[PDB]
């Protein structure tokens, strides 16, 4: 089934007049960023040469790269990761945009190719040899090695090791092909060579890869009564330079020309597409007249040894205006077809076909029979499915950009356990890879959320103890983003983010202490500290601090001073938690977690040691007495709380002595305030099924830096980045470049702790 999640339109910047339309490009990355071009056409033609980057969770904020492309942008293409964007226009000029300062709002291209005057008609990154297959029939198999498995693919152009080179290959409207190879250094090698000796028109082209490191490029000249020719390209590096070796493959003609009843209709091949890059053996063609069209699937299969035979074809359609092929790499064999028909799993078996009326058809891969139909109620000039293929984005024959959700069973009603197992399978696939799971949260209903969270934790267990290491913060981010979606579970998300932050501090503080000499070896001083704090249950802080070799815990008294704000957050969070004990609030989960309270104890002990070395590093508490040791008071109450939960099989409810002592804490100290990270402006909580949000671009339907705990003003003067998932704000450049704890600041250069990207926020100027 299909629901419009939202429709984002330009405001007053439509009504392109007196200059005709142009074809659009669209590219959905692995991270959820849409790069697309549109026909704005207001006071400049550079408004048709701007590349809009739209983060799919905050669509109002649309970045607009002013690409310096003198003709119209033919192709956009994200990386195998999500970090670079290739854009090529007519008259050569492939540009490779990369992020500036790891912001998803600042792009700049330093590298590019140029085959001047020849329009680029196909463009692709080279293949890096990673390919995995999804076994849906092993969805319950309780190990991620059985569900997703790598399929032994070889990368085109391996260079001195197992390591693939990165680079692109483009195919021009003449017979020319060009390969550019990026070195690990900034150098770039280009080579162009004709495809075959008979130089001819290439009006449509496409690029797939094979096992064996061969590119397979298909050319057509649009005439639909002329053959769709095929070339095998092999890249090599000869001693300094790229070298391209081409070879003709079996061409195909097309049915509806041998129909002999009325063969003259459909005279234009309008789309040529391999079914997926790295699936080079099947080809989807789309012949079209002015009003009607035919799509066809062909396959190379051998018996003339190799020979293109048809698989299927549609009967007759409207004129196909756009085509989107899926990206989810299903395993495609016969048992998996059977089990995905039985358990109605349909995410990887669909193509979307827009038409010149409003309709959109999601149609089968192998035998092109229509699986679902969505009537727009004007046509989609560009479509793109997502990487989990649960949502398709599309740009219309107006300014409108819409995101549709496709249900994983295509509208046929499933019992709740099957829907749970489908969405859990996809979230596990996004967990094993690093892809974003936002499109999945389009499909999670509130009433199932809690059950889904349970299943995640059960799948976080029973993996093989290294997967549990590498999937920790990913499953905390997925747990928080799932628990955002339901009113029963909306309270817990703050806890999860502080849990991330706690670990992010804890390890780093245990990273900073370099033991000056190895006493009691084979245990690093993080582990010595944890052992000593877990065996010594003394309520005083002095008695714990005595037994901890405190000539080891030494820093240079410069970074030790610069750690002040993180230590301030530690002390303030401990005090807030203990004062919150007598009362569902931002701290309710931590009171019964023994492990986090142990971590808070360990940080209070190392804070005490560092305070004895230098007293300026300590947090400050405004005390309503002057003969007070506030750190020892909070440590006494923390040990008395933690001994409740460090028991084996305990669940000890806290006794009344702790309750009255923590009632006395606002009398003795002032509980300050705290900032809680997920300032929720995400759409997925705001959306509802059967109701689409109609947004305008740029309309957007106590300020702290959350990572370095600096208080910005009322209206902050220094500029900031915001995370795109959690929403934490940091200032962009560091305040003191000399005194900067780079062990802490350099962790969050490329991402946030939750995982999302940074995104530059504009200043207010009130």
């Amino acid at each position: 089934m299909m629901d419009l999640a939202y429709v984002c339109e330009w405001e007053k910047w439509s009504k392109s007049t007196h200059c005709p339309s142009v074809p659009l490009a669209c590219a959905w990355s692995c991270r959820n960023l849409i790069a697309f071009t549109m026909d704005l056409r207001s006071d400049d033609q550079d408004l048709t040469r701007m590349i809009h980057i739209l983060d799919t969770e905050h669509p109002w904020d649309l970045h607009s790269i002013p690409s310096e492309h003198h003709e119209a942008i033919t192709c956009l293409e994200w990386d195998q990761s999500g970090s670079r964007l290739l854009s090529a226009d007519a008259d050569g000029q492939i540009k490779c945009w990369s992020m500036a300062d790891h912001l998803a709002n600042s792009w700049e291209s330093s590298v590019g190719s140029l085959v001047e005057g020849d329009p680029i008609v196909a463009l692709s990154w080279l293949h890096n040899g990673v390919k995995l297959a999804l076994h849906v029939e092993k969805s319950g198999a309780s190990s991620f090695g059985e569900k997703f498995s790598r399929v032994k693919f070889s990368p085109s152009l391996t260079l001195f090791g197992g390591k693939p080179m990165e680079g692109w290959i483009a195919v021009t409207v003449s017979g020319l092909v060009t390969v550019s190879l990026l070195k690990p250094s900034g150098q770039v090698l280009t080579s162009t060579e004709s495809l075959c000796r008979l130089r001819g028109r290439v009006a449509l082209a496409d690029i797939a890869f094979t096992g064996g490191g061969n590119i397979v490029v298909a050319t057509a000249d649009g005439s639909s009564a002329s053959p769709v020719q095929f070339y095998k390209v092999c890249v090599s590096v000869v001693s300094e330079k790229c070298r391209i070796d081409t070879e003709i493959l079996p061409s195909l003609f097309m049915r509806c020309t041998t129909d002999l009843n009325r063969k003259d209709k459909f005279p234009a091949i309008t789309h040529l597409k391999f079914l997926a890059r790295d699936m080079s053996e099947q080809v989807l063609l789309c012949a079209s007249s002015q009003t009607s069209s035919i799509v066809e699937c062909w396959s190379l299969r051998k018996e003339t040894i190799l020979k293109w035979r048809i698989l299927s074809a549609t009967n007759d359609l409207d004129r196909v205006s756009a085509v989107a092929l899926p990206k989810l790499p299903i395993s495609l064999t016969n048992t998996d077809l059977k089990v995905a028909s039985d358990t109605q799993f349909y995410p990887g078996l669909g193509l979307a076909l827009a038409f010149h009326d409003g309709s959109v058809h999601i149609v089968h891969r192998l035998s092109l029979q229509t699986m679902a139909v969505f009537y727009s109620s004007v046509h989609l000039k560009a479509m793109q499915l997502s990487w989990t293929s649960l949502a398709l984005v599309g740009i219309d024959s107006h300014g409108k950009l819409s995101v549709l959700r496709l249900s994983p069973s295509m509208g046929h009603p499933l019992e709740v356990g099957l829907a749970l197992r489908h969405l859990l399978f996809l979230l596990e696939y996004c967990m094993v890879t690093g892809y974003d799971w936002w499109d999945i949260l389009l499909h999670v209903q509130p009433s199932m959320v809690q059950s889904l969270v349970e299943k995640l934790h059960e799948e976080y267990t029973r993996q093989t103890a290294a997967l549990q290491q590498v999937l920790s913060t990913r499953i905390l981010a997925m747990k928080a983003s799932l628990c955002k979606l339901s009113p029963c579970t909306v309270t817990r998300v703050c806890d999860y983010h502080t849990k991330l932050f706690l670990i992010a501090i804890s390890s780093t503080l245990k990273s900073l202490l370099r033991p000056h000499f190895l006493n009691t070896p084979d245990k690093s001083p993080g582990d010595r500290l944890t052992e000593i704090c877990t065996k010594i249950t003394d309520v005083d802080i002095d008695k714990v601090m005595i037994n901890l070799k405190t000539e080891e815990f030494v820093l240079d008294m410069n970074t030790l001073q610069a750690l002040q704000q993180l230590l301030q957050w530690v002390g303030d969070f401990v005090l807030y938690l203990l004062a919150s004990l007598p009362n569902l609030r931002p701290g309710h989960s931590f009171l019964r977690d023994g492990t986090s309270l142990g971590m808070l104890r360990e940080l209070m002990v190392v804070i005490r040691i560092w305070g004895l070395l230098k007293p300026s590093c300590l947090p400050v508490y405004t005390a309503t007495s002057d003969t007070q040791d506030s750190m020892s008071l909070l440590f006494r109450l923390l040990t008395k709380l933690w001994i409740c939960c460090r028991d084996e099989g305990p669940a000890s409810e806290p006794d009344e002595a702790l309750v009255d002592e923590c009632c006395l804490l606002p009398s003795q100290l002032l509980i300050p305030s705290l900032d809680w990270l997920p300032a929720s402006d995400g759409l997925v909580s705001r959306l509802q099924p059967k109701q689409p949000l109609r947004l305008q671009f740029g309309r957007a339907p106590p300020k702290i830096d959350h990572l370095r705990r600096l208080h910005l003003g009322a209206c902050p003067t220094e500029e900031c980045k915001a995370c795109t998932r959690c929403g934490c704000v940091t200032m962009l450049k560091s305040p003191n470049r000399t005194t900067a704890v780079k062990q802490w600041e350099q962790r969050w250069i490329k991402n946030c702790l939750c995982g999302g990207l940074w995104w530059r926020v504009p200043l207010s100027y009130p």
């Binding site: 260079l159 090791g161 197992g162 290294a466 290491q469 245990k510 990273s511 780079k742 995982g755």
Partner: protein, 210 residues
């Protein structure tokens, strides 16, 4: 003498602040010892006989869709190697303490196999591998490597220790796991640490004693 030098560096936030100090004290002198006298702009690549340097930089698992190891092709210029050591940006990390040492070592093994297919004018040369790390290894077997997939760090460091590769560890923070791996990579059959905090164990190569 002829040397096949491979550096394996952890490109994460830890080793971020300490790298500049390590380079002046240990890495830069080690390159000079292989290349007598400091390099300046006259050294040319392309002599397939001679000393050939290489980098392998690895990462943790937080660079989630990006690749784990960035390898550089061999160079005969010590100067290009110095520019590569300047060009590393240490941006990674997050809420973790470990890193992917198995990946860096497996690609170092593939480097040494391609070196062994390269140099046939000499049967065996001085095959030196350094590991500049600040972090204990993960428990993951190696995933993004061919012919060394499914191997832990102990198995790979055994294969480094046999076949006569001289394995060294330079770490700015003294650690138990790194010492255990060094003890394991024992070649078949001196205090070099200028700073007391630094842990430097060099099976092969000569560094001024401090």
């Amino acid at each position: 003498v002829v040397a096949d030098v491979v550096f394996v560096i952890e490109g994460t936030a830890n080793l971020g602040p300490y790298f500049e100090g390590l380079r002046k004290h240990y890495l830069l002198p080690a390159i000079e010892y292989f290349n007598g006298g400091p390099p300046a702009e006259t050294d040319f690549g392309g002599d397939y006989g001679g000393t050939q340097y290489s980098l392998v930089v690895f990462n943790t698992v937080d660079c989630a869709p990006e690749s784990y190891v960035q390898c550089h092709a061999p160079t005969s210029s010590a100067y290009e190697f110095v520019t590569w050591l300047d060009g590393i940006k240490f941006m990674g990390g997050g809420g973790e303490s470990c890193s992917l040492i198995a990946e860096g070592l497996s690609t170092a093994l593939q480097l040494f196999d391609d070196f062994k297919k390269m140099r046939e004018q000499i049967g065996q040369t001085h095959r030196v591998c350094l590991l500049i790390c600040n972090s204990p290894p993960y428990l993951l077997p190696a995933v993004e490597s061919t012919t060394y997939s499914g191997c832990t760090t102990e198995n790979l460091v055994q294969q480094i220790g046999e076949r006569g590769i001289h394995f060294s560890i330079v770490s700015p923070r003294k650690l138990p796991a790194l010492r255990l791996l060094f003890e394991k990579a024992a070649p078949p059959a001196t205090d070099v640490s200028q700073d007391p905090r630094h842990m430097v164990l060099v099976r092969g190569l000569v560094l001024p004693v401090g």
